Amino acid sequence: GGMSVSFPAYLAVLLGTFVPVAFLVILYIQSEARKAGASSKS
Amino acid sequence: GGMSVSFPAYLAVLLGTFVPVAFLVILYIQSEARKAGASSKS
Amino acid sequence: ALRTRLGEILRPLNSEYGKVAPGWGTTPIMGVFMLLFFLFLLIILQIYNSSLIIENVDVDWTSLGN
Amino acid sequence: ASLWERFCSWVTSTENRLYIGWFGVLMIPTLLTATSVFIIAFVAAPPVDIDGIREPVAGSLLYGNNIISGAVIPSSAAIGIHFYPIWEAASLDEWLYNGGCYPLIVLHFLLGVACYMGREWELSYRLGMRPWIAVAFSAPVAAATAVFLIYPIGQGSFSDGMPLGISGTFNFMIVFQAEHNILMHPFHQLGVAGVFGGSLFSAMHGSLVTSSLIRETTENESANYGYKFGQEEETYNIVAAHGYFGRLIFQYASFNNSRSLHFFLGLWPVVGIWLTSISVSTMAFNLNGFNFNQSVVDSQGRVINTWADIINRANLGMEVMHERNAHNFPLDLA
Amino acid sequence: STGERPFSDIITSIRYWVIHSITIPSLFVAGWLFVSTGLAYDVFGTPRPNEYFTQDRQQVPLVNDRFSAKQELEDLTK
Amino acid sequence: GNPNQSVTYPIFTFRWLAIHGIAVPTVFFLGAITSMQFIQR
Amino acid sequence: MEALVYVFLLVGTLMVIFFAVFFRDPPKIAK
Amino acid sequence: SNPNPNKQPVELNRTSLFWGLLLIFVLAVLFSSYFFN
Amino acid sequence: RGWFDLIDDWLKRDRFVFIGWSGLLLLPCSYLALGGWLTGTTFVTSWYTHGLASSYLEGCNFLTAAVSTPANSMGHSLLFLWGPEAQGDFTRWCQIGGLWTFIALHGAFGLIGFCLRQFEIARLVGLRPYNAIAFSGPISVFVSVFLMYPLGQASWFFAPSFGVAAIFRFLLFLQGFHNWTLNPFHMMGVAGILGGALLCAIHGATVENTLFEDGDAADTFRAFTPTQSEETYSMVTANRFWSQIFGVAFSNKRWLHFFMLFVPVTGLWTSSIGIVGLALNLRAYDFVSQELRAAEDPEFETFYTKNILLNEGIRAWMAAQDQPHENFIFPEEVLPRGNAL
Amino acid sequence: SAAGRDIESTGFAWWSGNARLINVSGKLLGAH
Amino acid sequence: PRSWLTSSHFFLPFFLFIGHLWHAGRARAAAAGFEKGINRENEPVLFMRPLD
Amino acid sequence: LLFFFGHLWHGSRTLFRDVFAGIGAEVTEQVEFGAFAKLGDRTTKKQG
Amino acid sequence: MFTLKIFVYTTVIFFISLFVFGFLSNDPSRNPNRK
Amino acid sequence: TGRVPIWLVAFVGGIAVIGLLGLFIYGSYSGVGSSL
Amino acid sequence: MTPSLSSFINSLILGLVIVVIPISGALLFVSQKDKVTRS
Amino acid sequence: FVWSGEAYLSYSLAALALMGFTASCYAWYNNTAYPSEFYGPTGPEASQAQAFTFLVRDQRLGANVASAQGPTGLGKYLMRSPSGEIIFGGETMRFWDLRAPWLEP
Amino acid sequence: DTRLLIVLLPVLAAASWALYNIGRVALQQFKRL
Ligand code: CLA
Ligand code: CLA
Numbered sequence A, B: 001g002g003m004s005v006s007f008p009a010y011l012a013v014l015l016g017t018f019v020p021v022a023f024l025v026i027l028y029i030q031s032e033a034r035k036a037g038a039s040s041k042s
Numbered sequence C: 001a002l003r004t005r006l007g008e009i010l011r012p013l014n015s016e017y018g019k020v021a022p023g024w025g026t027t028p029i030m031g032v033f034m035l036l037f038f039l040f041l042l043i044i045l046q047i048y049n050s051s052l053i054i055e056n057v058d059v060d061w062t063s064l065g066n
Numbered sequence D: 001a002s003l004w005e006r007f008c009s010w011v012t013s014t015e016n017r018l019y020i021g022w023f024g025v026l027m028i029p030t031l032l033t034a035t036s037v038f039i040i041a042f043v044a045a046p047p048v049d050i051d052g053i054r055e056p057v058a059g060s061l062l063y064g065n066n067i068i069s070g071a072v073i074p075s076s077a078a079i080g081i082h083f084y085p086i087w088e089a090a091s092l093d094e095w096l097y098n099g100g101c102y103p104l105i106v107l108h109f110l111l112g113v114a115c116y117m118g119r120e121w122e123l124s125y126r127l128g129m130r131p132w133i134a135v136a137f138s139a140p141v142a143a144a145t146a147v148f149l150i151y152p153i154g155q156g157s158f159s160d161g162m163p164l165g166i167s168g169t170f171n172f173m174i175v176f177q178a179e180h181n182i183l184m185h186p187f188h189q190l191g192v193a194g195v196f197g198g199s200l201f202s203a204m205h206g207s208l209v210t211s212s213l214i215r216e217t218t219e220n221e222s223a224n225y226g227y228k229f230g231q232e233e234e235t236y237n238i239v240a241a242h243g244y245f246g247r248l249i250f251q252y253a254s255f256n257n258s259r260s261l262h263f264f265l266g267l268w269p270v271v272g273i274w275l276t277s278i279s280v281s282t283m284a285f286n287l288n289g290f291n292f293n294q295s296v297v298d299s300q301g302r303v304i305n306t307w308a309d310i311i312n313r314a315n316l317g318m319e320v321m322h323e324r325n326a327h328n329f330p331l332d333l334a
Numbered sequence E: 001s002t003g004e005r006p007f008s009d010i011i012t013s014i015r016y017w018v019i020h021s022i023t024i025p026s027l028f029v030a031g032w033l034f035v036s037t038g039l040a041y042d043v044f045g046t047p048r049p050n051e052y053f054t055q056d057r058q059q060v061p062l063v064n065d066r067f068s069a070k071q072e073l074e075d076l077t078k
Numbered sequence F: 001g002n003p004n005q006s007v008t009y010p011i012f013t014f015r016w017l018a019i020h021g022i023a024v025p026t027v028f029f030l031g032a033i034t035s036m037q038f039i040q041r
Numbered sequence G: 001m002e003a004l005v006y007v008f009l010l011v012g013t014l015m016v017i018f019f020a021v022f023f024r025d026p027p028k029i030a031k
Numbered sequence H: 001s002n003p004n005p006n007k008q009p010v011e012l013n014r015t016s017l018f019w020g021l022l023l024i025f026v027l028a029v030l031f032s033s034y035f036f037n
Numbered sequence I: 001r002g003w004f005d006l007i008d009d010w011l012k013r014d015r016f017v018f019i020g021w022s023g024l025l026l027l028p029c030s031y032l033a034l035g036g037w038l039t040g041t042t043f044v045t046s047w048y049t050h051g052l053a054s055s056y057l058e059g060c061n062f063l064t065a066a067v068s069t070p071a072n073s074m075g076h077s078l079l080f081l082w083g084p085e086a087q088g089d090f091t092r093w094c095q096i097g098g099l100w101t102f103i104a105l106h107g108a109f110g111l112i113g114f115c116l117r118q119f120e121i122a123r124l125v126g127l128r129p130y131n132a133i134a135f136s137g138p139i140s141v142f143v144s145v146f147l148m149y150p151l152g153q154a155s156w157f158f159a160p161s162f163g164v165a166a167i168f169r170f171l172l173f174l175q176g177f178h179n180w181t182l183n184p185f186h187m188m189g190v191a192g193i194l195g196g197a198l199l200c201a202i203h204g205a206t207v208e209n210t211l212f213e214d215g216d217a218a219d220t221f222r223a224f225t226p227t228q229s230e231e232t233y234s235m236v237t238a239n240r241f242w243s244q245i246f247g248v249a250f251s252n253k254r255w256l257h258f259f260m261l262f263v264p265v266t267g268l269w270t271s272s273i274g275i276v277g278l279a280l281n282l283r284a285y286d287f288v289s290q291e292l293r294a295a296e297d298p299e300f301e302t303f304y305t306k307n308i309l310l311n312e313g314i315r316a317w318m319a320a321q322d323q324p325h326e327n328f329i330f331p332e333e334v335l336p337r338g339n340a341l
Numbered sequence J: 001s002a003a004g005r006d007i008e009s010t011g012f013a014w015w016s017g018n019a020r021l022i023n024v025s026g027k028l029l030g031a032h
Numbered sequence K: 001p002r003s004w005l006t007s008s009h010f011f012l013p014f015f016l017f018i019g020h021l022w023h024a025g026r027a028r029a030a031a032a033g034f035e036k037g038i039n040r041e042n043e044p045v046l047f048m049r050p051l052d
Numbered sequence L: 001l002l003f004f005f006g007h008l009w010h011g012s013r014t015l016f017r018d019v020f021a022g023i024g025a026e027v028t029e030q031v032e033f034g035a036f037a038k039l040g041d042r043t044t045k046k047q048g
Numbered sequence M: 001m002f003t004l005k006i007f008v009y010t011t012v013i014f015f016i017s018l019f020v021f022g023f024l025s026n027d028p029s030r031n032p033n034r035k
Numbered sequence N: 001t002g003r004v005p006i007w008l009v010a011f012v013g014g015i016a017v018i019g020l021l022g023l024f025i026y027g028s029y030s031g032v033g034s035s036l
Numbered sequence O: 001m002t003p004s005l006s007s008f009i010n011s012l013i014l015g016l017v018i019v020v021i022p023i024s025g026a027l028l029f030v031s032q033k034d035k036v037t038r039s
Numbered sequence P: 001f002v003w004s005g006e007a008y009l010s011y012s013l014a015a016l017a018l019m020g021f022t023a024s025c026y027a028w029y030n031n032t033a034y035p036s037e038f039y040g041p042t043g044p045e046a047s048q049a050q051a052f053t054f055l056v057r058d059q060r061l062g063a064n065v066a067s068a069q070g071p072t073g074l075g076k077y078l079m080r081s082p083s084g085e086i087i088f089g090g091e092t093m094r095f096w097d098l099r100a101p102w103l104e105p
Numbered sequence Q: 001d002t003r004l005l006i007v008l009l010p011v012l013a014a015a016s017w018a019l020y021n022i023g024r025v026a027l028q029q030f031k032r033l
């Protein structure tokens, strides 16, 4: 009926996930949009 | 010496900020990388 | 266009695109049923609002009682 | 060629990123010390005795106070409208207890928007254009003078002015309508017809432009990409948007002169906020709103309540409960 | 520019004031006798200033029932 | 300048009916509201 | 404990005010 | 499984980023005081 | 020829006022709502509803007169003239309070007829339908304060009454009983209306100030014909002025006028979302972090904590007079007074 | 001789038609 | 009478300040020349370098 | 309440599909007052 | 505490004498169309 | 000449607007609803 | 049979009878006066 | 300066705005050039006469009118000014700089 | 009932003067179309 865990660690995991996850999705979408800008509509 | 606030609301604000903030930086960087792919190196 | 065994048995359902009935069609048949449904919707709104209290219809919470 | 004229032609130069003109020699250092004291005293100010009754109010972010409760609290009422700078205090924290941060922000902010208003004149001189955007900014500057300076001038202390915070503005409005009846004042009545009316004409004129654009664009892309910036031709048919709105109401209820239309956009909210800023300042000297309490009487003389009495039962309930231990005598400032 | 008789060539016409230099008073007078012969109080239910209270009813009148409000408002005045 | 001497024009247009819906109640009610304030209690 | 959140949000929206003035998309004309 | 003709790219200029970075922050300025309660 | 195609030719004809197919819904329902307010503010009392004299017939002026809300005793009733409450009688139906549901139902069916009109003009003259979209703000306030707010509450009594001073109750009614001001949807609405009043003032008084010298007279209102191809004002100078005064400036006239559409409407739509939640008493009343603290510290005080005590002054003094059907017989010793007044 | 009592004799319209006395000093003295 | 004399002497000299802002603007714009609007043959912004 | 707006947007869009990019050059002569008997009908244009 | 009053009144007079001697230095010649 | 001027029909309709609004301010200081 | 029921059916007739007058009044007003070259 | 007719008006409107704001604060604060027997009592001295007329009344009921022990802990009738003068207590301590000819004796 | 025809009698006097000046010319319109 309960498990006393560290309350800042929900921010350590989810910001520890979603800040570097969003860094790679920033870099991947612009890499394919540069391919789409160069191959198509050149 | 203390202020008892809602502990899930740190996740409601910071994921409420950094998930739509990262959505717009995903869309902006690929929009300029498509401009850089089309204008330059065509 | 890929044609499969399921897309061949559903073929005459997505067939007659833009194959309408000429002129006015069944629009005066439709306007009777739209009027009767709106006449149905003013009845049950006034039954709920007790502006149409009918015999042996009690809109209290004590209707489903013992 | 002089040692001053080479400086005097830099201040009045339009080549800078922000215009730094001769009114900007006064509004840049006054607003930056009305910003640097506002940002610090919103985070880490100590609690402030606003009423002079030795009960401090804690309105900064350190002391609890989520930002729809925190405020730079007004000055002490024992100080009043006396000039209270830092050097007239015995110590800097004694200056913070009496609420010295509120006149240091609000005399620099009011002197900063008064020289923002001259700076809005000043770039309209060096760019060579008609200069009356200073007149349209004189409606917020007067309204920021009415709640911050003229209401502390008429009503005595600086504690009666508006607190620099979000929940302080809601406390300022309830205490105002307790003692001055702003809701039944015929000049605040005009201001909410220039606020609703100004919000109407923004949603009306902004609609009829964007509903009558000529298509210099494709279908899938955005509509705003069809107006090349700095073009010569108009991007919307004024004759079609007039012929729209001449069918909506009738033909002669709509301006097919777009200069008289756009002046009517600059006249309806600006005159309305001029009449609000008067009303709060005329209620500062206690020329209150309309008082139709107990007017309707029958033949026997018994009082019949009207709708101004149910406003008054609200107005009396926020009269007995504001300043709950600051009153010692039965009449409020009489 | 629509095809009908224009507005300001009606107001300035001499037949327009020959027809209702009287019926703008005759609606003003008909409005006057609606509120002075006691008809405005009667057909709209508004009480006269001596008909607010009643010798049998010193309190304020308020409706209590919903369906028998016709029976109540009859017994609330006189 | 001169009156419209001979050109035909309809008299009972819909703009006549649209005005008299808002004008004939107005001059009835003004005059009813004018008679309300000579009423002494 | 939670005043760190309000100071981060108010400074963090004061940087977007700073970046929209000086790092804006420059409206050049069209010749 | 042919190549799609109906695909189209998405644009977002720097003005639309600075409005969206202002909006998501100010709604977090507004609603943080109510989420924390 | 035809029969239905005939009536489309007559109703959509060009006249001084336009009827259209929306005019069969608008022009009766706008007439009996705008006229039904004006005949109950003039004659019809509120004495048997609220205990309030509110009409011009019994001694009220333009401010303190209204068609008041019907009763608590009726309770969500549609209150027809032929209905079970006031059967047949016109004088009882005015006395029960049935003119309020004569106006607010004809108003709710007139704003349908005006927004269908803005679809019908823009389709016929060939425009884009961005005026019926901008009118959906004013629809969503009338459908959510006058209809969806009292339907969630108790009755039609707690609705806004159509009058000038009767609205001024309803602003202070939602302050004391609801702490409406602290509601963040309403604070989204104040920055939508005062933002729209800014954008109407700052755009209207900069194109009267950066305009081209097109004429030769001293006044500039004569120097514009409607059908001119050239721009009547200088976009590049108005971009140059606000880039150095403010720091940001519009570069798109086409995006500028959409921002004058979006800022009032999406301010008016957001505060309409909150007052739907105010019908259920899902209000943003108190900060529970600061009510626990102010109960556990008798020297912790903020303007929020001062705003709660002002609400208990409003809800305890007005309650004997605002809701007289409840019979609140509060003595003078138990209502919260302050000190010395 | 006589001057300035119209729209296209001075430029100002009638609602500004009190400011046709700036370069007219005799009428302005009788205006004060 | 103090409450009329002080209230109306915000109504007059605030407005008398507004017409000063109208006329200090207009007199320096009429003496310079651009009181009827921007000259279309040479507007001064187009002969300036842009901001950035 | 929010779905009432999006229906009103989509009902605006499915009727006004051909003017979604903006109005054409055919608008200017069909709008000005008293030109046509029926509004938005170029077969009625009312002359002599 | 007096040293702040010496320091503020240095700063307030410095921007006031830039204001007064700035507008005295031929301000209506800082327009376009001549000089 | 068979014509009324346009400024004359707004003048005698303009006095009656001041005339009706003049009686509405007098009637707020007299009669019913004037606290007398 | 209930007086609250029969008042609703009488409202349907009185809703019909008064608001058949703009049904016929927009039909006499077109067959006597119509457009010149249209549908 | 600018030397024109619209200029010389504009210099005088800013000067008359300065005199009109000053003539308001004469009428709201001064009671010597605008005497109280003619214009009525001022904003401050109405608030100070109320503290005086209840300093009289409770002294006539036999209270020691100093050592009042007011409700917030401060002076109810008589109080101390921030510069150290004996002034009237209550809300009227903001109007402590009042010079009025019925209390200056 | 008897005071209703005191109110409507200036209205009946209004339409009687209106149908004196228009009844020649309102007959022209209904016979035209
Ligand atoms: C044997 C026959 C039979 C019976 C006994 C029922 C029984 C019922 N039907 Mg029903 N029905 C039947 C046949 C039958 N049906 C048939 C054949 C059809 C045609 C397919 C329908 C179609 C139908 C519909 C469409 C609805 C019902 C509903 C109902 C319920 C009414 C009670 C209730 O809670 O309504 C309460 C609901 C109302 C009174 C509806 C009022 C809605 C108003 C008119 C409009 C409100 C929205 C509007 C946009 C206004 C917004 C403004 C806002 C601010 C207020 C009840 C269970 C209603 C239901 O299930 O709701 C729970 C309902 O909406 N029936
Ligand atoms: C000095 C004047 C001043 C300032 C800066 C503000 C600022 C604000 N008011 Mg406020 N207010 C004022 C005077 C002022 N008010 C007066 C005189 C009254 C009447 C008594 C009110 C009544 C009032 C109400 C009733 C409400 C506000 C609200 C607001 C907020 C949003 C405003 C909005 O949407 O409008 C439109 C805004 C713009 C067109 C431009 C944006 C301006 C931004 C938001 C100002 C930010 C100021 C802030 C301190 C940051 C400064 C940064 C600086 C330190 C670098 C904002 C914090 C609302 C609120 O609670 O939201 C929190 C609200 O409900 N105000």
Ligand code: CLA
Pocket: J014, J015, J016, J017, J018, J019, K015, K016, K017, K018, K019, K020, K022, K026, P009, P013
């Ligand atoms: C001593 C004061 C003074 C003087 C001599 C002038 C002189 C002038 N002004 Mg100016 N002005 C002043 C004060 C003054 N102003 C003030 C205080 C303001 C701020 C409100 C303005 C704002 C202003 C504007 C905006 C404009 C002028 C203009 C002008 C010129 C023509 C005036 C005209 O035609 O108006 C004619 C008069 C009217 C049209 C009547 C206006 C009536 C107002 C709206 C109502 C007044 C309400 C009043 C308090 C109570 C009335 C009682 C009511 C029951 C009737 C003239 C040089 C014009 C200009 O630039 O010309 C070069 C112009 O466009 N003035």
Ligand SMILES: CC(C)=CCC/C(C)=C/CC/C(C)=C/CC/C(C)=C/CC/C(C)=C/CC/C(C)=C/CC/C(C)=C\CC/C(C)=C/CC/C(C)=C/CC1=CC(=O)C(C)=C(C)C1=O
Pocket: D038, D039, D042, D043, D067, D165, D166, G010, H026, H027, H029, H030, I184, I187, I188, I189, I191, I192, I195, I196, I198, I199, I202, I203, I206, I235, I238, I239, I242, I246, I248, I249, I250, I251, I252, I262, I263, I264, I266, I267, I270
């Ligand atoms: C330490 C600190 C900072 C303490 C302070 C704490 C504190 C007070 C915090 C609160 C701060 C805060 C931001 C609160 C906001 C409250 C809140 C909940 C906001 C929600 C946002 C909201 C309402 C969203 C809904 C959408 C909506 C309705 C938005 C309204 C938009 C708005 C408010 C303003 C835009 C209006 C505006 C400023 C327009 C200026 C336009 C302008 C000058 C353009 C430039 C320009 C003009 C021209 O005319 C021309 C011709 C050209 C060419 C040109 O370019």
Ligand SMILES: CCCCCCCCCCCCCCCC(=O)OC[C@H](COP(=O)(O)OC[C@@H](O)CO)OC(=O)CCCCCCCCCCCCCCC
Pocket: D018, D027, D028, D031, D224, G010, G013, G014, G016, G017, G020, G021, G027, H013, H015, H016, H018, H019, H022, I245, I246, I247, I248, I249, I250, I251, I252, I255
């Ligand atoms: C001291 C001297 C004076 C300095 C003042 C500095 C103030 C600078 C303010 C800049 C705001 C920029 C906002 C980004 C927005 C932005 O930069 O957009 C940039 C945008 C550019 O428009 P364009 O003409 O480039 O449009 C073209 C494109 O839209 C085409 O798709 O400007 C606007 O839309 C109008 C700006 C309105 C005014 C901005 C809103 C004001 C509210 C600010 C919120 C304050 C919150 C405070 C919380 C603590």
Ligand SMILES: CC1=C(\C=C/C(C)=C/C=C\C(C)=C\C=C/C=C(C)\C=C\C=C(C)\C=C\C2=C(C)CCCC2(C)C)C(C)(C)CCC1
Pocket: F021, F022, F023, F024, F025, F026, F029, F030, I031, I032, I034, I035, I036, I038, I039, I102, N017, N020, N021
């Ligand atoms: C409900 C009812 C009904 C009826 C309705 C109607 C028909 C109404 C009408 C109404 C009308 C038909 C009218 C009324 C009123 C009006 C008025 C009351 C007017 C006017 C006034 C005013 C407007 C004021 C003032 C002014 C002036 C004088 C001008 C200038 C401006 C001002 C504002 C100042 C029916 C049958 C359905 C049935 C049931 C009952």
Ligand SMILES: [Cl-]
Pocket: D326, D327, D328, D329, P089, P090, P091, P092
């Ligand atoms: Cl006190």
Ligand SMILES: [Fe+3]
Pocket: D205, D206, D209, I257
């Ligand atoms: Fe526009």
